[PDB]
Design a protein around this ligand. Structure first.
Ligand code: CLA
Ligand code: CLA
Ligand code: CLA
Ligand code: CLA
Ligand code: CLA
Ligand code: CLA
Ligand code: CLA
Ligand code: CLA
Ligand code: KC1
Ligand SMILES: CC1=C(/C=C/C(C)=C/C=C/C(C)=C/C=C/C=C(C)/C=C/C=C(C)/C=C/C2=C(C)CCCC2(C)C)C(C)(C)CCC1
Lengths: 250, 165, 168, 153, 160
């Protein structure tokens, strides 16, 4: 075995502490401890003080030696070493022990979410719960923009109804004429104007970028997107009018 | 046990004690047992929020309901429900109705784990061997044991309130 | 764990507990005889202590000096020891019994080992060999509980000024 | 086997099977235990008095103010008997008959039978059930006494 | 299903509203379990009104603390507010067990009305159908009798 690790006096370092050092230190470093490693000091002293060597030390030299050796509490135990050796294995295997940020910190949720996607080198395929979970996937797929089997005008109508119904509120309330007796027809006009402006922007997008994911086969490129935008304008008008009708009637 | 093995190591005082002192699970099929758990977790998850909602309302924090009723509602959560404006209650029912619709029809949970309403099963491992993770069974215990306590707790709140104030 | 001492085993929902979360047994294995002897003797006295505080409230010894009211558990000690008194009658008695333990295990308690500890030899009720194991654990489990019980009795009774069985 | 006694045989002028007898045996032993607890339980508020005391819920320092064999109530200890009822259920839902593989075995938590004095099977199992039968009649007869024939003693 | 214990004689397969055109095979047993449970409750419910009418109210005290001689509690509706909530809780608990006993889950022996009473177990003399059909038929009569009895106690005001 290694020469300097045999018959080392307990006064230099205790048996349990030495075993803890040897466990913490990687095996390949036992023969020649590097430098600034407790094992390096153990070697540099056990080769000077021992049974066949200098058996006594000055009180100050021994005092300084006792403050260079580990104090039996600053060394990781077997379970902690297992924690590290397995945490690093998880991290390198592409799996992340799931954690959630909290009040300046994060709680470990005790879950192994496989992190690297199907393309391990792709940066945007790292799968997370909020985008790649079952609920997230089915929610995104079932949106009007993505729902299967919807004609482009249906997607446009649904999105427009949502936008037009919502956009009335910010104007009819806390608007310039929020306290007038009408106070809602103004909001209706402003919401219809916002719907028209964003529809014009969508028409610009469809006449410049021309997305072709909604076009049926053998059609003018971007025709599906243009139809979706026109029916979004129609749906925005309808939703704004419906919200105004509900506000006035009720 | 056979079929109760699908919900094994997940209940009892200690985690691996199938309690069932009524035979409610024996002779029942695997899908029925999974559906019984889906009912248990859903009750418990609502019970946990119910108890938290009860305490943040029985202490004096009913802002939406003090600002809608234009007066501080009574601390007693049962009596505060009556004072809460009917528009508020109907919207509360509708929001849960949308959530219950959303989970069931558009984004259904799997049929093997009908309680994965968020759907971690497509990114979770649950079967690896790491220590600093793969404690998902333990956090399943904490959800179930806490939720079961919340279920009997919230009933105690309602029963005592409706009887001995 | 701790020789063959019966502190663990038959100890609740788990068969064996083995509660030594400081290592006072592994660190000092030569004292497992002393520790058991101390643990048992603590339990027996505490059990007599708790059953003590209650019975004076009903019957009083015929010593005719203890036959006086107002001698609760916060003043009986400092009252009986006199200028001697009943407390020395008890202390002398405890000396007589404790001297017997010396004879059985030698003067230095060299014979004290991990199996004869807390075994004065008074065998009237026990029977068989497995019951002795069962009764030994039943002894300690009662004894350890009363050690914490009389600890709560003495502290709570004198702090909150209870001095009687509720000790509240 | 088991509770078959000596002065009478199977005493079945009405179960008479295996599985049905097993459930009936569980009822028999269960009723036997309560009566023995109740019979000795009723004699104690008698001589040795209504022993209780100490700070109890709405019954602080209550000297077991539930008098008479029925116990009555009036917010005196009998309302606290509901806590006995609740905690009796806890033992009835944790250490119960569904995991009680034999007739009415609770795995002998106290280990009284591990040579402490009771024994497995033979007279002890027969003595428990026979004593339970006597106490059940005694407790019922004691119930009649309190109702229309004064008190216990 | 057209050959179970319910078809007595005066009426055949009496399903005017068509619960059986779509009634699944397990749904029959589920609804049969509902019918058997309903009928047995009704028989107990009926006895529970006709018997305190002729036979006097219980000689006793009902609640040993709140002076209930069984005579201040009327036989019929309104007794729900006279009997204590705990005597109501305790009967609720007793009925609570009687179903949290040996299970009546779908497919279990408790799901077809079998629980283990066996007060009348004739030695299979072609009478198992007789006792079964009688229990179902009487339960059907008891349910109808109770609802009339409930309307008798309500519309008139008290008792009958
Ligand atoms: C400056 C604001 C503004 C803008 C840019 C648009 C823009 C548009 N509107 Mg419009 N609209 C507005 C205000 C505006 N609207 C207001 C205030 C009203 C209320 C009278 C309407 C009522 C309105 C109707 C009724 C219709 C449009 C339509 C259209 C589209 C043609 C185009 C996207 C048409 C459309 O969407 O067809 C595709 C259409 O039929 N608008
Ligand atoms: C569901 C369809 C619906 C219904 C029931 C109503 C109902 C009503 N609208 Mg209306 N409206 C609708 C769609 C509808 N609108 C749409 C789609 C538009 C966009 C063109 C409008 C634009 C509109 C204006 C500009 C005005 C009304 C007004 C009115 C009220 C007369 C009445 C409550 C009038 C009103 O009472 O305003 C206060 C009014 O001035 N609406
Ligand atoms: C919505 C209620 C509900 C449901 C559906 C379940 C479902 C389940 N539990 Mg469960 N549990 C609950 C509440 C519930 N739990 C509560 C509140 C507690 C705390 C005491 C527990 C404690 C518990 C333990 C300790 C264990 C289970 C287990 C199980 C599983 C086995 C099936 C079973 O036990 O019976 C399913 C059927 C029911 C529970 C029927 C519901 C109760 C019926 C209707 C009667 C109760 C009425 C009640 C007496 C009166 C209501 C008021 C009351 C609060 C006083 C199953 C998934 C076992 C398991 O999976 O472990 C591996 C197990 O060991 N549970
Ligand atoms: C079982 C779940 C549950 C249910 C059915 C209710 C039901 C109700 N809550 Mg409530 N609440 C809950 C959980 C729940 N709460 C939780 C977990 C909290 C802590 C955040 C609160 C905090 C809370 C406040 C502060 C108030 C209510 C109020 C109300 C009442 C009016 C609806 C409303 O404004 O809710 C609003 C609920 C929230 C803003 C909480 C959102 C947190 C969600 C649950 C996170 C997911 C209604 C009876 C109001 C009232 O007047 O009570 C009588 C009111 O002012 N709740
Ligand atoms: C002064 C009282 C005292 C003493 C001397 C002991 C002594 C002992 N106990 Mg112990 N114990 C006590 C009180 C005591 N106990 C109490 C109050 C409890 C209840 C919480 C327990 C619960 C307990 C369990 C569950 C177990 C022991 C065990 C042991 C033995 C080995 C552990 C050891 O070295 O402890 C010595 C400890 C000290 C001397 C510390 C004294 C207090 C410091 C100064 C603070 C040893 C004979 C184990 C055993 O018997 O192994 C088979 C075992 O499994 N004990
Ligand atoms: C103060 C009370 C008290 C009393 C009444 C006794 C009484 C006795 N001790 Mg004792 N002893 C005491 C305190 C006491 N001891 C203390 C404080 C210690 C130190 C821990 C000892 C240590 C001790 C030893 C080591 C021995 C005795 C022995 C004896 C017996 C010899 C008789 C004798 O010489 O009488 C006059 C006697 C029964 C002897 C005996 O019988 O044991 C074999 C013996 O060898 N004693
Ligand atoms: C809880 C009540 C209940 C239930 C669940 C059943 C269930 C059943 N009966 Mg049944 N039955 C009942 C009451 C009930 N019965 C009563 C009271 C009578 C006496 C008139 C009968 C007479 C009867 C006969 C003669 C036969 C059955 C049969 C059947 C079985 C097949 C028919 C079916 O699907 O019925 C389903 C039943 C229902 C869904 C009940 C719905 C009741 C509606 C909603 C209301 C009816 C009006 C009501 C009286 C209004 C009350 C007024 C009040 C509001 C004030 C099935 C197991 C047949 C059978 O066994 O075939 C093999 C058969 O031959 N029953
Ligand atoms: C065979 C059963 C039966 C019998 C013997 C009676 C007997 C009686 N009913 Mg009656 N009843 C019954 C079933 C029955 N009811 C049912 C099932 C209903 C609901 C459809 C009613 C609804 C009913 C009303 C509404 C009235 C009676 C009334 C009466 C009394 C005249 C008499 C005591 C009358 C009465 O005394 O008032 C309650 C009366 O007005 N019955
Ligand atoms: C809050 C203070 C507290 C009390 C008051 C308390 C009480 C008892 N504990 Mg306990 N305990 C903790 C704290 C407390 N325990 C903690 C933090 C842990 C996690 C490390 C823990 C774990 C265990 C285990 C593993 C066992 C155990 C035991 C007993 C026991 C014996 C009863 C009997 O055997 O007579 C009694 C009275 C044994 C067992 O039997 O539990 C029934 C046994 O195996 N405990
Ligand atoms: C707060 C909250 C939230 C959210 C929510 C939301 C987001 C909502 C929305 C809502 C909405 C946004 C709604 C809307 C609706 C709409 C509607 C309902 C509409 C309708 C329309 C109509 C009906 C129209 C019609 C028409 C047309 C189409 C054209 C012609 C004319 C007319 C009018 C006929 C969360 C969950 C996050 C959480 C918490 C709570």
């Amino acid at each position: 075995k290694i020469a300097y690790l045999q018959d080392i006096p307990r006064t230099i370092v205790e048996k349990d502490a030495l075993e803890l050092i040897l466990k913490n230190t990687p095996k390949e470093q036992w023969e020649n401890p590097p430098e600034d490693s407790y094992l390096y000091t153990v070697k540099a002293f056990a080769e000077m003080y021992g049974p066949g060597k200098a058996t006594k030390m000055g009180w100050w030299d021994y005092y300084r030696l006792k403050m260079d050796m580990p104090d039996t509490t600053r060394l990781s135990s077997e379970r902690e070493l297992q924690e590290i050796e397995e945490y690093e294995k998880l991290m390198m295997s592409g799996k992340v022990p799931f954690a959630v940020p909290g009040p300046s910190g994060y709680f470990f949720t005790g879950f192994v979410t496989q992190w690297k996607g199907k393309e391990p080198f792709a940066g945007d395929q790292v799968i997370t719960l909020t985008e790649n979970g079952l609920f997230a996937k089915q929610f995104l797929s079932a949106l009007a923009f993505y729902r299967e089997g919807l004609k482009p005008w249906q997607r446009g109508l649904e999105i427009g109804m949502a936008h037009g119904y919502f956009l009335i509120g910010p104007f009819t309330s806390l608007g310039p004429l929020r306290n007038t007796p009408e106070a809602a027809t103004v909001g209706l006009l402003c919401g219809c104007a916002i719907v028209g402006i964003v529809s014009i922007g969508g028409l610009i997008f469809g006449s410049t970028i021309k997305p072709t994911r909604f076009d049926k086969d053998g059609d003018k490129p971007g025709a599906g997107f243009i139809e979706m935008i026109n029916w979004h304008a129609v749906g925005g008008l309808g939703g704004a009018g419906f919200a105004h009708a509900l506000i006035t009637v009720f | 046990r056979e079929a109760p093995k699908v919900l094994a190591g997940t209940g009892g005082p200690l985690p691996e004690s199938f309690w069932d002192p009524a035979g409610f699970t024996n002779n029942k099929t695997d899908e029925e047992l999974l559906f019984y758990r889906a009912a248990e977790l859903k009750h418990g998850r609502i019970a946990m929020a119910a108890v938290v909602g009860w305490f943040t309302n029985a202490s004096g924090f009913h802002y939406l309901g003090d600002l809608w009723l234009k007066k501080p509602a009574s601390d007693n959560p049962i009596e505060a429900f009556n004072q809460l404006s009917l528009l508020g209650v109907f919207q509360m029912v509708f929001f849960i109705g949308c959530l219950e619709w959303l989970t069931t029809v558009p984004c259904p949970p799997p049929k093997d784990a009908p309680w994965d309403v968020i759907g971690m099963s497509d990114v979770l491992e649950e079967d690896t061997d790491e220590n600093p993770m793969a404690e998902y069974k333990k956090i399943q215990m904490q959800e179930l044991n806490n939720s079961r306590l919340a279920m009997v707790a919230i009933i105690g709140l309602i029963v005592q309130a409706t009887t001995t104030g | 764990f701790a020789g063959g001492l019966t502190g663990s085993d038959y100890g609740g929902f788990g068969g064996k507990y083995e509660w030594d979360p400081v290592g006072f047994s592994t660190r000092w294995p030569e004292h497992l005889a002393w520790y058991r002897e101390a643990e048992l003797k603590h339990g027996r006295i505490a059990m007599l202590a708790f059953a003590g505080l209650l019975a004076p409230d009903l019957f009083r010894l015929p010593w005719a000096e203890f036959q006086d009211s107002s001698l609760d558990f916060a003043n009986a000690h400092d009252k009986f020891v006199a200028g001697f008194g009943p407390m020395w009658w008890g202390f002398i008695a405890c000396g007589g019994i404790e001297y017997q333990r010396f004879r059985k295990l030698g003067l230095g308690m060299e014979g004290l080992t991990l199996e004869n500890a807390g075994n004065l030899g008074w065998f009237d009720l026990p029977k068989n060999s497995e019951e002795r194991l069962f009764y030994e654990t039943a002894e300690l489990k009662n004894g350890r509980l009363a050690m914490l019980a009389v600890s709560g009795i003495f502290t709570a009774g004198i702090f909150w000024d209870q001095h009687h069985f509720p000790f509240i | 086997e088991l509770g078959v006694q000596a002065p009478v045989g199977f005493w079945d002028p009405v179960d008479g099977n295996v599985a049905s007898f097993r459930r009936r045996r569980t009822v028999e032993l269960k009723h036997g235990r309560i009566s023995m607890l109740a019979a000795m339980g009723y004699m104690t508020p008698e001589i040795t008095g209504k022993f209780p005391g100490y700070l109890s819920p709405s019954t602080l320092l209550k000297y077991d103010d539930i008098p008479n064999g029925l116990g009555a109530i009036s917010k005196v200890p009998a309302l606290g008997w509901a806590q006995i009822f609740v905690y009796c259920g806890y033992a009835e839902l944790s250490q119960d008959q569904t995991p009680g593989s034999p007739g009415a075995e609770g795995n002998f938590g106290f280990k009284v039978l591990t040579s402490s004095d009771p024994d497995s099977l033979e007279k002890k199992l027969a003595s428990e059930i026979a004593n339970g039968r006597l106490a059940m009649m005694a407790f019922t007869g004691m119930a009649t006494q309190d109702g229309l024939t004064g008190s216990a003693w």
